[PDB]
Design a binder for this molecule. Sequence first.
Ligand SMILES: O=C(O)c1ccc(-c2nn(C(=O)c3c(Cl)cccc3C(F)(F)F)c3ccc(Cl)cc23)c(OCc2cccc3c2OCO3)c1
Ligand SMILES: O=C(O)c1ccc(-c2nn(C(=O)c3c(Cl)cccc3C(F)(F)F)c3ccc(Cl)cc23)c(OCc2cccc3c2OCO3)c1
Lengths: 257, 265
Amino acid sequence: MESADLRALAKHLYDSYIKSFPLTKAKARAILTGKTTDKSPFVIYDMNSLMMGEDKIEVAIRIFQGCQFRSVEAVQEITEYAKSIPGFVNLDLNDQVTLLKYGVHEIIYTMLASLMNKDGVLISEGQGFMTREFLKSLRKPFGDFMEPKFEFAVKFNALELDDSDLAIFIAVIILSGDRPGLLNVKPIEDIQDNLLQALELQLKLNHPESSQLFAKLLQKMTDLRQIVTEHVQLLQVIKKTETDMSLHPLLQEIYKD
Amino acid sequence: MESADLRALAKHLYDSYIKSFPLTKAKARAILTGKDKSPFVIYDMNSLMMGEDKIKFKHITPLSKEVAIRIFQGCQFRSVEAVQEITEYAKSIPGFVNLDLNDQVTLLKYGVHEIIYTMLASLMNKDGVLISEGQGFMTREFLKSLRKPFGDFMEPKFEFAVKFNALELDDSDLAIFIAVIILSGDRPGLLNVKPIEDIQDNLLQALELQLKLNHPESSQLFAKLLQKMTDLRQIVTEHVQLLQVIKKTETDMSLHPLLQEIYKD
Ligand SMILES: O=C(O)c1ccc(-c2nn(C(=O)c3c(Cl)cccc3C(F)(F)F)c3ccc(Cl)cc23)c(OCc2cccc3c2OCO3)c1
Ligand SMILES: O=C(O)c1ccc(-c2nn(C(=O)c3c(Cl)cccc3C(F)(F)F)c3ccc(Cl)cc23)c(OCc2cccc3c2OCO3)c1
């Protein structure tokens, strides 16, 4: 509840966010808008370019497993970031697990948007770019599993957040006192209140011409909760057809309840 | 013409050290020496069962049921919090945040073990260790008597602590010492050693002056303190080898994968 302390917290979370995540939104936007010369991605738009892409950098399964593997790495990255949020590690250890269990998916979607435009998504640390049309054209259940990520990303990216905004936003999501099964809601909400104050000041200073960006950003936490539910529900259905798939135990545990 | 600058740097680090760490050495010594508000003492299984039911130690609450495992992991979890505390303290060392971000991460990664040991001695005497911000006191004998490898994992910390505490450092000494450890130019993988050593050279100057003024009767205390970095590197190395033996033999260490992720380092 002090401006300079709120600014200090924003700088702390931004700095830690840079340390925890390999590919920032700033880097991803430089790659996506191009204009540069050797940060240029190889573009995978069909079966044959995928085959060529392996030498430079079932098709639907291999792409799914590529997402699963990246998602697991994201969980690791998010987990390392979470420990830097002031107060998180001091919480009851079961609550730490619970907050990560229910928060990682919402964060993955958020940060996935940083890697997307309307035409595709960066992969392999920005070295490749896989087109939305190719992903949507994958077979049976896999195509319609890829596309909702793009649907969200386009809407979310219209807010034009930069990384210093996202670092606080991601922190706010993690410290959600309403997660099922929390033992100690009060210290979680005390931390989130500081993060919320920090976010509000951040958005007012960094986006002063963007009216009610704070409220509009929080209304996006609504769209996240819905899409994680559809994702989980659709992911389970895929399990009932595809035994040539298996989830990483880290993800397997997260989805269990 | 920089005596006053070293005092300023000394005071700056002392003030910041007080803000970052929960239980100071000065406070911890009053408790250990008995100088009212007496900590709960854990000297065996039944007293542990009572203290976790009364005081509710956060690192020793069920989340394995085996007591020696639960105490081992409780140390791990407290070490995780200490890392964040040291990380926040590091940001206050003049020049640290201006270093290359990868080097900041590298220095913290390879220093936290040495610092946690150093600061653990503050909470220790020859008879046990303070826990939960001084609310509990777990005896050396109870820790040393734990089964299989866990007992022999606890006791080397006390052996180091007893020798380190004979230097009789206070918090104003330790604040500079901890900073010197952090700014180690020989950590593997550093990108830009020169500014790291430039800072350590200032911190070393401040530590030397601090020790002469604070311990004028303790000859070559500076040299003796730097010689303890030998004892630190050695035991951190031994510590790593002891953890791997525990990991490769103990089938009862399963935790939720998220928790394993938090504790990964
Ligand atoms: O770099 C990243 O930060 C990142 C993050 C997420 C994906 C990605 N996951 N995903 C999932 O379903 C998913 C999600 Cl959201 C959350 C949890 C578990 C899963 C799982 F388990 F079910 F997957 C996607 C679906 C579609 C798209 Cl477009 C991307 C993702 C990510 O994807 C990079 C990527 C995209 C296409 C092909 C790839 C690839 O990496 C290698 O090959 C990056
Ligand atoms: O409050 C503190 O400032 C503190 C600091 C350290 C410990 C503690 N770590 N530990 C380790 O092995 C260890 C060490 Cl040195 C360095 C790096 C990583 C580790 C790790 F990761 F491997 F742990 C100990 C071993 C024995 C003892 Cl005695 C204490 C420590 C500490 O421990 C307090 C504590 C907390 C909960 C249960 C306890 C307990 O002490 C006994 O039971 C506090």
